[PDB]
Design an enzyme around this catalytic site. Structure first.
Site, PDB file in Angstrom:
ATOM      1  NE  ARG A  33      -1.356  -1.254   4.139  1.00 48.09           N
ATOM      2  CZ  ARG A  33      -0.442  -1.962   4.794  1.00 48.09           C
ATOM      3  NH1 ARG A  33       0.729  -1.419   5.098  1.00 48.09           N
ATOM      4  NH2 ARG A  33      -0.699  -3.215   5.146  1.00 48.09           N
ATOM      5  CG  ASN A  86      -6.418  -3.950   5.554  1.00 52.14           C
ATOM      6  OD1 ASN A  86      -5.801  -2.935   5.879  1.00 52.14           O
ATOM      7  ND2 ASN A  86      -6.975  -4.765   6.442  1.00 52.14           N
TER       8      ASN A  86
END
Length: 99
Positions: free
Chosen positions: A24, A42
């Protein structure tokens, strides 16, 4: 300048080794290249939902970049987008990472 940047909206979803990874962090960098808005986070199940918003000129390339390119610790067992449609314009100011 350009003729017209038809802003569009669409989401994404990756499956595989994109759970226990800090990929990320890299998404925030590559996201600046093309120049789009959105966020990164997530789910409780085990996937990463990244809502990308930008012009088809940038989205058309982003779709064929995130599905192929990516860190070695981010196996893309399955990559597909959803909610593809045109709208007035973006609904954000810039990209950011959400933990």
């Amino acid at each position: 300048g350009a003729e017209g940047n038809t802003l569009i909206s669409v989401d994404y979803e990756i499956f595989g080794k994109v759970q226990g990874v800090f990929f990320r962090k890299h998404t925030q960098a590559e996201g600046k290249k093309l120049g789009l808005v959105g966020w990164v986070q997530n789910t409780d199940r085990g996937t990463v939902q990244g809502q990308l918003q930008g012009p088809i000129s940038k989205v058309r390339h982003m779709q064929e970049w995130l599905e192929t390119r990516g860190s070695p610790k981010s196996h893309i067992d399955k990559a597909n987008f959803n909610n593809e449609k045109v709208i007035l314009k973006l609904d954000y100011s810039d990209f950011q990472i959400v933990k």
